[PDB]
Amino acid sequence: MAKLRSSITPGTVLILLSGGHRGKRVVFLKQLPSGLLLVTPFKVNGVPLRRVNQRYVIATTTKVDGVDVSSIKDEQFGLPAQFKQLQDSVDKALLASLSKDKLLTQYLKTRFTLRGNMRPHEMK
Amino acid sequence: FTRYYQPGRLCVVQYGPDAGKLCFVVDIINQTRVLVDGAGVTGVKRQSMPVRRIALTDQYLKIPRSVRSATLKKALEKDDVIAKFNQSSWGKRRLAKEQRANMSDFDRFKLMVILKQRRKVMQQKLKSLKK
Amino acid sequence: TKQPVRLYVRGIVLGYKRSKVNQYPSCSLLQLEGVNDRKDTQFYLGKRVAYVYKAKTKQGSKYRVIWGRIRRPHGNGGIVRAKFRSNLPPSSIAGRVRVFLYPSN
Amino acid sequence: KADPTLQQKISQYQVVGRKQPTEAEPNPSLFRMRLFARNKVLAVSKFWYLLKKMKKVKKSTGEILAVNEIREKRPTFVKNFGVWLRYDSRTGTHNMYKEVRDISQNGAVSQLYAEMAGRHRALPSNIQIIRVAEIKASQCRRAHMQQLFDSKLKLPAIRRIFPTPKDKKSVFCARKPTLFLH
Amino acid sequence: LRALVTVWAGHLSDECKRRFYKNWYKSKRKAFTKYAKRYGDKMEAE
Amino acid sequence: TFKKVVVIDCQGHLLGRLASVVAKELLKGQQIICVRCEDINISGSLHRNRLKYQRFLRLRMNSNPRRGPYHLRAPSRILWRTIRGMLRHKVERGQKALARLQVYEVPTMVERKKRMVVPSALRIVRLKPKRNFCRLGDLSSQVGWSHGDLVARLEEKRKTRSSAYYQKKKERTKMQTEAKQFAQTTLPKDQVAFLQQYGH
RNA sequence: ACUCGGAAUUGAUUUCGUUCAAAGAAGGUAGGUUCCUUGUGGACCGUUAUAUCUUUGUUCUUUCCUUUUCCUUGUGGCUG
RNA sequence: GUAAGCAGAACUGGCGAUGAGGGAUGCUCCUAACGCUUGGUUAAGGUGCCAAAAUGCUCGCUCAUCAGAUACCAUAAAAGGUGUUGGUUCAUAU
RNA sequence: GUCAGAAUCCAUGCUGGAUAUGCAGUGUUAUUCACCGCCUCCUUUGUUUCAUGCAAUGAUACAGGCCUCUGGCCUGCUUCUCAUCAAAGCCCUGGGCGAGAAUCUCAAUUUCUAACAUUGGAGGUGAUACAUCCAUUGCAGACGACU
Lengths: 124, 131, 105, 182, 46, 200
Description:
Radius of gyration of chain B: 20 Å
Number of strands of chain D: 7
Strand content of chain B: 15-25%
Strand content of chain D: 25-35%
Shape of chain B: elongated
Oligomer: part of a larger assembly
Largest sheet of chain D: 3 strands, antiparallel
Largest sheet of chain B: 5 strands, antiparallel
Order of helices and strands of chain B: EEEEEEHHHH
Helix content of chain B: 40-55%
Structural class of chain B: alpha+beta
């Protein structure tokens, strides 16, 4: 199976690099087979529960601390009724916690640009 | 003609492996190249560094000529020249370029939220002070 | 309007791997913005690249791509070798190229 | 981490061979010589070349016992060297006496092959440095050495062309540079 | 050198005006007619 | 990997050393203006360089010198040649590179834009001092370029024009950085110490 | 292909470095004299004094380099 | 033989029968000998631009009112120089 | 560091400039349904050696410079601006309101930039000409051309 990197601990903020939600900053829950990252709050970002591949994702030093986690499995993911209810069940704990910090809630909701002068090998 | 290659002048090392660290002069070898070192805690081992590589700093601690690397450390701790350079400009923006390099993504986000909030208040005074 | 929020490094097609007197158009040759030594290059190895361009006719859109990836550095400067699915056309020279920053680390 | 680029890769070596035993002449007289060279091998090459000029000996007829590396005693501080040497011009041979200043004997001989090639066009093959003695300040007879001696010596930095570390370098800049610096 | 602005008179004769045509006998002879009404309405701008 | 346009100020600059940088950048696809080409420098004395330009005028096609080497007197046109000398200009690719380049001996247009400096190809850096140099504006007016003293007048006119712009800007650089010092106080005391880490 | 790393060994059984002790010196500090061009001055005399360095022992250090054999984690390429 | 890209020999290696990379350009010099090719590494030779790679680092010398710049190779000498940079050895600072 | 100085050199003057596929100014711009402009608003196609912030206006010197100048700064555009809060969307004069955005089911260029030309529409203002052949000339002429 795909090994995790030492950056990605549970909790931590990623950023998505490709697909329909490119740029957006998204918090990591659990590694699933197929070795994919379950990475998910839909009120904040407007991205759902989804499996993102490890290599289309930059990890970040920023982190967040209730959530169900262990029930959800790869049989799920491969307009809908049950999925919308499972979503709002999972983000009970996070919406309470991310009501606190407004620097952190903005940080999720903005999306990451390569802005001109910055060189992404001398990044961090 | 301020600034002399003399014993115990502070130097920014601009080129070479050290790159960006501070050093003291000990002794002039010949008309090129000088016996540069640091006791600590810059941590540049003593060597025959060329003159081209090293920008001279304003501050010096006065000590006699060829010198043991211990007897810097005693004469350093009284003066604290490395601290006093670091107060002034050039000294400040040297540390800025170290800490800009080491920012996180959230730490880079922090900056631009504060800087834009400043500009709301900056534009309110620029209209008000005009009025 | 314009493209919002770019996630790629931006890059020029210099030419091909060559001598004075011989192309080897298998191996394209690539300069990246910012990147200026071999030491800075070792981020970009592996990372996948696209020449985009536009044509007069194909599958519901006027643009084409040639995907590739970065292979290895080239000399003591920043410049870095690449391999595309096709060989790159010599029309593509002094021509812009998107280096995406996946796959990541 | 220590910069390879400044110095030449000279190291000093002691050598000791002894000819070779025979039934006529058992227990020969032993030799010794300090040499400068790249390597432990290339010292032995230079030993047999020089010993061929002195005495009726060869590499085949000879036998070598020890190749001791020598270094400086204390390489921290600066000292004066009076180097004796000979070289071969396109006319003929000339003995010289140069005076060089560095932290080490290895540093002096690196500095001398640069100096000697640059002035007199003397090839590496021709030069043979005879002995490298340490000298007191009140001993060097050359005028370019004497200006440096004295405590409180000062030297202002004039016209500051910095060799920028690569990556620092950019082909275009805005401001135009500043060379007096201050 | 480079011409900035040409100013002309109010009333040119048919002597001068022939220069601007290669066929005078055909033409309705329009040269400096829009200019002449523009002049009466002169050129102390230009 | 590069800007839209790059306007070069060419005073203080050495003629070949500049051109070799400028050539390679035209091949990489950068679009360039050169500006104040009369003030560009060359190593060697004035007499030495004019003697070398006289060896150039001696060349001509003997059959019909209408056809042959065009001896170009203007500084803008002189720099243009040495850039073309560092390009395979007969081939189609080489020709494209010249197309990008624009050379001027300063007009309207790009007085309003910024002028950059190539630092490697620069006289104060390169020429070890005492060693005699020559300005191209002098060398050209020796060899039948008539328009020296206009490019004196127009520059001297638009330097007064620019110093009028400067003292507006310099007054409203003060005025922003005065209103900065108010705004830096009134926002809370945590975030002031935050900016003094990172310089701002 | 490039790297983060270590673990023992060889030399001069430490190259250095570093703590003391005595001895000596000049490219002579404190200290005297004295002098201008008033200095981050110079001549004369002074040997550690309100700076020091070097030679020779000694206090405890395993790295600079250089032999010797061998276990390592990080990214990438090509082919299957 | 004054000499010749001249004539005649000895030993080995080439060209002829042979491309490829270098010497700008060259049957004979250098590297190196060839089935179609993917990747890696070098050779001779090079790294301001034409031109793939250093306006790399480090230490000397040189200012040419015809500088100089890479073996075969595309020419230069006798004799001079208080132009400058070092050396050798005498004589009272020169 | 300067100065004088030639039957020399470069200009000037003179010849050409379809010797730069070079550049400027000015006149008139098609008999009134009939085409033809110019300036906005918005759609058809098709060009670009090359859109993703493809950005930034003192003037100098380098054995010195710059000023917010009793002070402060230089040792690089290595900076300084710009980049937020929902959609490259919809609403209120340029800032500000809200809203369950996903199953685009693990990436597929992030299809919309820019001006240039063009097909056909809206509204505002406008315009009602020349050249060639032909005949004649002889300041010209092999024929074209030229007067």
